[PDB]
C-alpha cells in the first residue's frame, strides 16, 4: 500500500500550489491516479507519473478525493492496493464566514474552547482548519437557524498541540469539495502551566516581573485594543522584569522565544486608578 | 535487587513517507514487557511479556490514553525542534527519551533517569538529584526555561519516587520465576585455525539472563585484554542472551590459555580450557 | 507504568 | 550524523543438521532508524519473518532483532541482507555456525 501525501497541505487556495506525492516501495515512483466518483479510472487518461503531480497554479477542477497506485511489475496486476486517500480542498469560492471564540481565544492549558462558525450565507457544511502544514480539516454539518448557519467545533483539552491560527470555511451542496474564502483568522493561545510573573506599580509605570527566565512580556488591558510587547530584561537581583511606561485593569504574561502561541498563568488583575 | 525499570519513546517524523510515528517500549532489567505503536489500526498499549497479561481492563486503559497524550505531545515537540535550529520542513527528524528507576535489593529508589535526546545526539536530561536539569545546545536552553517555569522536575521527581518505584516492585513480583532468577550461561571453548602457526580461541557463553556477563582471556593468569575479540551480546531470541570472547594464539600455547566467565547465575566464577 | 507528565519542548 | 549498522547472523540453538531451529539477524549501533533486513534462504527472502519492536541503547543507537523458523542444513546456505541510508548496497552477512 502506498503513501499519499499533498505538499504543503491538501486544503489550497485557487491560484495556489498543492503537490501529490505517492510513495510506494522506497521510491517516488511512477503511479497512477484515481477519483472517488468510481476508483478505477485513472485521471488524466491513464496518465503515468514519473516524480510527483505539482497542481500548480490550483483550479476548481484540482479539488476531489485522490488515491493513487505505484507500479508493481512483477505482479498479477502489476500494480499495487489502492493508497491512502487524500481530500483537496480547494477554497476561496464564496463570501468568507465568521469565526467566534466561546468565551475567547486564551484558553487556559487542561481546558476547552468553542469555536463557533457562522454565515448568512446558507453553507451546508463548515471546515475547521488549523494553520500549518500537513493538517487536515474538521468538518461539522451547518444548522440553520434565525437567518444564519452555523456550527460549533469543540476544541479540547488545551494543549501547546492545539494551539495556533484557526481559520473556517464553508460548503455549499453539489460542491463539497469546494470552500468559501477563508473566515478572518483566529489565534488561539495556551496559557499556562508556566508560573505566572507579579505585576505591580513602580504618570505610572507598570513593571511585571518573574524569577522564571521568561523572553518576553505581553501587557494587557482587560477590554482593551492591542496588547503590549517587551523584551524581559535579567535584571541585578536576577528576576526577569519589563517596565510598561503608562485607568482600568491590566494583566501580565511571560513568554519564551520561538514559542508564539503560548503564554504563562495570566498574572494577578491590577487596579490602575 | 538491584532492578531497573525503563520507558524508551521514539518520535519521528517523514515529511512525504509516512504521518510523524511514536513507540514506546517498556522494560524491566532486559526484558521487554510492554510497546506502543502510533502506526496502527487502533493504537494501544500492548504486553509484550507473559507476566503482564492478568493485568486488568484499567491498566491498559490508562496505559493507553497517557501514551495517545504523549504521541501527540512529541508529534508537537517534532514541530518545535523545527523552530529551534531553524530546521526544513521536508527533513526526517527524530526526538529519542528514556526515563525510569533504579531500585535496590529491599526494593527502594537509588536512582532515577530522565534523559531526551534529538537526532541521535543529547538534548535534555534530568540531574541526579532530579531537580535540575542539563542542556546540551541552547535550543535545550530554551527547553530547561520552560520545563522550570512549568516545574516538571517536581512532577518527574514525584513520578519516580512513587509510581515508578510501587510499579517496578508488582512488577518484579508478578515474573519473579523469570525476572529474579537468574539463568547460568551454558559455556564452552572452540578451536580454529587460522594458519599452521597460530589459531584462534573462542570462549562461547550462551543461554544466560540478565544480559550483563564477563568474559576474559587470560595467559597465564594475566587477563589479554587487548589483543582479545568481544561481540556484542546478542539476544537469543527467547528473552536469553549469547555472547563469545576470541583470541589468537601461537601454535601449541593452548594450554597457557584460559577463559573465565562471571555471571550472577552461578554460584561461583567460571574458568575453562581447551584440549 | 509510564509517566503522566508532560513533557512539552 | 548517521551511524552504520553492525550485524551478527546466528541461531538460538546450538545448529544441528534435521533439528528444528530459529534463525536471527541482530542488526544495531544505527542510526536513524529507517532500516531493511531480510533473511535469505540461497539468496531468497523467507516469507514468515518477524522482528522485535523499536529501541535503542543508551549511545541512543537503535537495535533490532529479526527472526525465523529454520532447519540447519549443508545444503541450504542462510544469510542476512540489511540495507540502510549509510549503505549504496544491501550487505549479506551468511550464517557460520561458528561465529
Ligand atoms: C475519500 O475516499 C475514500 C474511499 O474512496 C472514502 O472512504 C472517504 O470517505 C473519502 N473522504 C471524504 C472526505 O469523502
Ligand atoms: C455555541 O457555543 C457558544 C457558547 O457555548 C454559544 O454561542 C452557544 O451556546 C453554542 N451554540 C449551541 C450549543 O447550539
Ligand atoms: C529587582 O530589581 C528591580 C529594580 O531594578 C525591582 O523593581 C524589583 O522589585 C526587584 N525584584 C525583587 C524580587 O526584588
Redesign the interface.
Same mark, same amino acid.
Given at each position: 500500500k502506498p503513501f499519499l501525501s499533498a505538499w504543503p497541505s491538501a486544503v489550497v487556495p485557487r491560484g495556489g500550489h498543492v503537490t501529490l506525492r505517492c510513495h510506494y516501495r522506497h521510491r517516488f515512483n511512477n503511479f497512477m491516479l484515481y477519483k472517488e466518483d468510481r476508483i478505477h479510472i485513472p485521471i488524466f487518461h491513464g496518465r503515468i507519473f514519473q516524480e510527483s503531480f505539482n497542481m500548480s497554479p490550483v483550479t476548481t477542477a484540482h479539488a476531489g478525493n485522490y488515491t493513487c497506485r505505484g507500479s508493481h511489475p512483477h505482479s498479477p496486476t502489476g500494480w499495487s492496493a489502492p493508497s491512502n486517500p487524500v481530500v483537496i480542498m480547494v477554497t476561496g469560492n464564496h463570501r468568507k464566514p465568521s469565526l467566534l471564540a466561546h468565551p475567547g481565544p486564551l484558553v487556559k492549558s487542561g481546558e476547552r474552547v468553542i469555536l463557533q462558525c457562522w454565515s448568512d450565507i446558507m453553507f451546508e457544511h463548515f471546515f475547521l482548519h488549523k494553520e500549518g502544514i500537513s493538517k487536515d480539516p474538521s468538518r461539522l454539518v451547518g444548522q440553520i437557524h434565525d437567518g444564519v448557519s452555523k456550527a460549533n467545533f469543540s476544541i479540547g483539552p488545551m494543549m501547546l498541540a492545539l494551539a495556533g491560527t484557526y481559520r473556517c470555511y464553508g460548503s455549499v451542496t453539489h460542491t463539497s469539495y469546494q470552500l468559501s474564502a477563508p473566515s478572518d483568522p483566529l489565534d488561539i493561545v495556551v496559557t499556562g502551566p508556566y508560573e505566572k510573573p507579579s505585576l505591580s506599580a513602580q504618570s505610572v509605570t507598570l513593571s511585571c516581573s518573574s524569577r522564571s527566565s521568561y523572553d518576553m512580556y505581553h501587557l494587557s488591558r482587560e477590554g482593551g485594543a492591542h496588547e503590549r510587547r517587551l523584551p524581559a530584561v535579567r535584571k541585578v537581583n536576577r528576576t526577569f522584569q519589563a517596565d510598561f511606561p503608562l485607568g482600568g485593569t491590566y494583566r501580565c504574561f511571560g513568554s519564551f522565544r520561538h514559542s508564539p502561541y503560548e503564554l504563562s498563568d495570566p498574572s494577578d488583575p491590577l487596579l490602575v486608578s | 535487587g538491584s532492578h531497573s525499570m525503563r520507558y524508551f519513546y521514539t518520535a519521528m517524523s517523514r515529511p512525504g513517507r509516512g504521518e510523524p510515528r511514536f513507540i514506546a517500549v517498556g522494560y524491566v532489567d532486559d526484558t521487554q514487557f510492554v510497546r506502543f505503536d502510533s502506526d496502527a489500526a487502533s493504537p494501544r498499549m500492548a504486553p509484550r511479556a507473559p507476566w503482564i497479561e492478568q493485568e486488568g481492563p484499567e491498566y491498559w486503559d490508562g496505559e493507553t490514553r497517557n501514551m495517545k497524550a504523549s504521541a501527540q505531545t512529541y508529534r508537537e515537540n517534532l514541530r518545535i525542534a523545527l523552530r529551534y535550529y531553524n530546521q526544513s520542513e521536508a527533513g526526517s527528524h527524530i526526538i529519542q527519551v528514556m526515563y525510569g528507576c533504579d531500585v535496590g535489593p529491599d526494593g527502594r529508589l537509588l536512582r532515577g533517569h530522565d534523559q531526551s535526546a534529538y537526532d541521535g545526539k543529547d538534548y535534555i536530561a534530568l540531574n541526579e538529584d532530579l531537580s535540575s536539569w542539563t542542556a546540551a545546545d541552547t535550543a535545550a536552553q530554551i527547553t530547561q526555561r520552560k520545563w522550570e517555569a512549568a516545574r516538571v522536575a517536581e512532577q518527574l521527581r514525584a513520578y519516580l519516587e512513587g509510581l515508578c518505584v510501587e510499579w517496578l516492585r508488582r512488577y518484579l513480583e508478578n515474573g519473579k520465576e523469570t525476572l529474579q532468577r537468574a539463568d547460568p550461561p551454558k559455556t564452552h571453548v572452540t578451536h580454529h585455525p587460522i594458519s599452521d602457526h597460530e589459531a584462534t580461541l573462542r570462549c562461547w557463553a550462551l543461554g544466560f539472563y540478565p544480559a550483563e556477563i564477563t568474559l576474559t582471556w587470560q595467559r597465564d593468569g594475566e587477563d589479554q585484554t587487548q589483543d582479545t575479540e568481544l561481540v556484542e551480546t546478542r539476544p537469543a531470541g527467547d528473552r536469553t542472551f549469547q555472547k563469545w570472547a576470541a583470541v589468537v594464539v601461537p601454535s601449541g600455547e593452548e594450554q597457557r590459555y584460559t577463559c573465565h566467565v562471571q555471571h550472577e547465575g552461578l554460584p561461583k566464577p567460571l574458568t575453562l580450557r581447551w584440549e | 507504568? *509510564?509517566?503522566?507528565?508532560?513533557? *512539552?519542548? | 550524523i548517521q551511524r552504520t549498522p553492525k550485524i551478527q547472523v546466528y541461531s538460538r540453538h546450538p545448529a544441528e543438521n534435521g533439528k528444528s531451529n530459529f534463525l536471527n539477524c541482530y542488526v544495531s549501533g544505527f542510526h536513524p532508524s529507517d532500516i531493511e533486513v531480510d533473511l535469505l534462504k540461497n539468496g531468497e527472502r523467507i516469507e514468515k519473518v518477524e522482528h522485535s519492536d523499536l529501541s535503542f541503547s543508551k549511545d541512543w543507537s537503535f537495535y533490532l532483532l529479526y527472526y525465523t523458523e529454520f532447519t540447519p542444513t549443508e545444503k541450504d546456505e542462510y544469510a542476512c541482507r540489511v540495507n540502510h541510508v549509510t549503505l549504496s548496497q544491501p550487505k549479506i552477512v551468511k550464517w557460520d555456525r561458528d561465529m
Amino acid at each position: 500500500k502506498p503513501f499519499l501525501s499533498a505538499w504543503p497541505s491538501a486544503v489550497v487556495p485557487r491560484g495556489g500550489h498543492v503537490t501529490l506525492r505517492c510513495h510506494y516501495r522506497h521510491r517516488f515512483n511512477n503511479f497512477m491516479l484515481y477519483k472517488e466518483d468510481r476508483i478505477h479510472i485513472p485521471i488524466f487518461h491513464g496518465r503515468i507519473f514519473q516524480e510527483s503531480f505539482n497542481m500548480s497554479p490550483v483550479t476548481t477542477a484540482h479539488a476531489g478525493n485522490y488515491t493513487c497506485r505505484g507500479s508493481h511489475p512483477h505482479s498479477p496486476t502489476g500494480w499495487s492496493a489502492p493508497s491512502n486517500p487524500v481530500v483537496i480542498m480547494v477554497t476561496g469560492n464564496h463570501r468568507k464566514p465568521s469565526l467566534l471564540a466561546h468565551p475567547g481565544p486564551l484558553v487556559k492549558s487542561g481546558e476547552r474552547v468553542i469555536l463557533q462558525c457562522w454565515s448568512d450565507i446558507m453553507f451546508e457544511h463548515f471546515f475547521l482548519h488549523k494553520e500549518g502544514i500537513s493538517k487536515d480539516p474538521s468538518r461539522l454539518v451547518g444548522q440553520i437557524h434565525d437567518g444564519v448557519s452555523k456550527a460549533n467545533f469543540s476544541i479540547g483539552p488545551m494543549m501547546l498541540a492545539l494551539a495556533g491560527t484557526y481559520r473556517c470555511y464553508g460548503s455549499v451542496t453539489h460542491t463539497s469539495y469546494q470552500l468559501s474564502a477563508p473566515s478572518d483568522p483566529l489565534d488561539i493561545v495556551v496559557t499556562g502551566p508556566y508560573e505566572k510573573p507579579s505585576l505591580s506599580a513602580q504618570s505610572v509605570t507598570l513593571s511585571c516581573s518573574s524569577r522564571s527566565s521568561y523572553d518576553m512580556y505581553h501587557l494587557s488591558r482587560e477590554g482593551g485594543a492591542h496588547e503590549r510587547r517587551l523584551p524581559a530584561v535579567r535584571k541585578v537581583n536576577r528576576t526577569f522584569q519589563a517596565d510598561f511606561p503608562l485607568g482600568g485593569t491590566y494583566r501580565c504574561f511571560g513568554s519564551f522565544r520561538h514559542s508564539p502561541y503560548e503564554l504563562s498563568d495570566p498574572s494577578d488583575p491590577l487596579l490602575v486608578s | 535487587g538491584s532492578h531497573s525499570m525503563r520507558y524508551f519513546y521514539t518520535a519521528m517524523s517523514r515529511p512525504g513517507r509516512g504521518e510523524p510515528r511514536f513507540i514506546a517500549v517498556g522494560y524491566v532489567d532486559d526484558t521487554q514487557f510492554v510497546r506502543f505503536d502510533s502506526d496502527a489500526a487502533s493504537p494501544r498499549m500492548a504486553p509484550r511479556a507473559p507476566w503482564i497479561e492478568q493485568e486488568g481492563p484499567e491498566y491498559w486503559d490508562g496505559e493507553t490514553r497517557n501514551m495517545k497524550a504523549s504521541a501527540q505531545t512529541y508529534r508537537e515537540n517534532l514541530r518545535i525542534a523545527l523552530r529551534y535550529y531553524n530546521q526544513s520542513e521536508a527533513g526526517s527528524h527524530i526526538i529519542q527519551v528514556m526515563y525510569g528507576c533504579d531500585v535496590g535489593p529491599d526494593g527502594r529508589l537509588l536512582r532515577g533517569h530522565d534523559q531526551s535526546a534529538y537526532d541521535g545526539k543529547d538534548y535534555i536530561a534530568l540531574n541526579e538529584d532530579l531537580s535540575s536539569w542539563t542542556a546540551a545546545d541552547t535550543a535545550a536552553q530554551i527547553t530547561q526555561r520552560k520545563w522550570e517555569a512549568a516545574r516538571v522536575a517536581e512532577q518527574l521527581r514525584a513520578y519516580l519516587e512513587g509510581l515508578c518505584v510501587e510499579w517496578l516492585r508488582r512488577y518484579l513480583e508478578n515474573g519473579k520465576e523469570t525476572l529474579q532468577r537468574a539463568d547460568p550461561p551454558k559455556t564452552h571453548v572452540t578451536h580454529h585455525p587460522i594458519s599452521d602457526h597460530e589459531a584462534t580461541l573462542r570462549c562461547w557463553a550462551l543461554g544466560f539472563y540478565p544480559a550483563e556477563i564477563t568474559l576474559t582471556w587470560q595467559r597465564d593468569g594475566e587477563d589479554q585484554t587487548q589483543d582479545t575479540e568481544l561481540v556484542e551480546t546478542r539476544p537469543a531470541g527467547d528473552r536469553t542472551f549469547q555472547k563469545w570472547a576470541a583470541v589468537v594464539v601461537p601454535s601449541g600455547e593452548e594450554q597457557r590459555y584460559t577463559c573465565h566467565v562471571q555471571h550472577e547465575g552461578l554460584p561461583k566464577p567460571l574458568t575453562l580450557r581447551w584440549e | 507504568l *509510564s509517566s503522566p507528565v508532560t513533557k *512539552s519542548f | 550524523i548517521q551511524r552504520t549498522p553492525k550485524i551478527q547472523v546466528y541461531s538460538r540453538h546450538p545448529a544441528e543438521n534435521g533439528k528444528s531451529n530459529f534463525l536471527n539477524c541482530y542488526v544495531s549501533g544505527f542510526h536513524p532508524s529507517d532500516i531493511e533486513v531480510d533473511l535469505l534462504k540461497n539468496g531468497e527472502r523467507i516469507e514468515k519473518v518477524e522482528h522485535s519492536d523499536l529501541s535503542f541503547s543508551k549511545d541512543w543507537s537503535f537495535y533490532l532483532l529479526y527472526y525465523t523458523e529454520f532447519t540447519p542444513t549443508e545444503k541450504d546456505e542462510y544469510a542476512c541482507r540489511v540495507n540502510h541510508v549509510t549503505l549504496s548496497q544491501p550487505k549479506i552477512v551468511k550464517w557460520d555456525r561458528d561465529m
